[PDB]
């Protein structure tokens, strides 16, 4: 086409979606990880995760307001990944990298799994 | 912080949100413009437009499944702007620039209004 493009548009959209999440505006699901609860937007979860994409395209699960993750999933690993989904920023540290990689493999977040594998190989 | 960042993350999120829109997955509102109907995600509309942001943060309007725009709004101008919201790409042409600018002013999309003003000043 003959379109023009606004370079910062996608980043600005994601920043506003994170602002809505922080104020709990139009969040439509709670993700339960052990005792911890995380409110989010189903569309953002689907856009970032192969697992959530499969869950919310399912004719029955698409209507659930609560999703319980596998008990092996670490709440901190999930929190770091949920923050990444809404910001593009990953808080990857020596103390959390194993929990982050395991959670990203479960959530099917291919790019996160790739950077975790590379950071582990380097050490 | 000590975060790492995935450059293409915001663009990839927006691409997936557009894929959901095209398949009509988890759309929660219909925007009525004259006779024309446009299905969308409230969160994406809010993230892109000062007008939708005001509408869906309103305790009563946040629950509406149908929003009717002012009858002066041109459906083609709206369609071009809705496509921009989900792609960062604006189909700005000599034949639509006046309708696009008027719709962007009404929707409160400051960056679109700015490029329309500059393109008009050049001609």
């Amino acid at each position: 086409d003959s379109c023009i493009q606004f370079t910062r548009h996608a980043s600005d959209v994601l920043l506003n979606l994170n602002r809505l999440r922080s104020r709990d505006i139009l969040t439509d699901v709670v993700i339960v990880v052990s005792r911890e609860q995380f409110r989010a937007h189903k569309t953002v979860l689907m856009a970032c995760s192969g697992l959530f994409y499969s869950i919310f395209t399912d004719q029955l699960k698409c209507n659930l307001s609560v999703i319980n993750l596998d008990p092996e999933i670490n709440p901190e690993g999930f929190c770091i990944l949920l923050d990444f989904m809404y910001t593009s920023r990953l808080n990857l540290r020596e103390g959390n990298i194993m929990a982050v990689m395991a959670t990203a493999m479960y959530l099917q977040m291919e790019h996160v799994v790739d950077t975790c594998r590379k950071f582990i190989k380097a050490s | 912080d000590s975060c790492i960042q995935f450059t293409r993350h915001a663009s990839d999120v927006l691409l997936n949100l557009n894929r959901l829109r095209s398949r009509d997955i988890l759309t929660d509102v219909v925007i009525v413009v004259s006779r024309e109907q446009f299905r969308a995600h409230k969160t994406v509309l809010m993230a892109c437009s000062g007008l939708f942001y005001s509408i869906f943060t309103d305790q009563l309007k946040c629950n509406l499944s149908v929003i009717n725009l002012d009858p002066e709004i041109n459906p083609e101008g709206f369609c071009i702007l809705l496509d921009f919201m989900y792609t960062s790409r604006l189909n700005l042409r000599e034949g639509n620039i006046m309708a696009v600018m008027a719709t962007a002013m009404y929707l409160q999309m400051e960056h679109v209004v700015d490029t329309c003003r500059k393109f008009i000043k050049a001609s």
Partner: peptide, 4 residues
């Protein structure tokens, strides 16, 4: 704004 750019030419994509």
């Amino acid at each position: 704004w750019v030419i994509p």
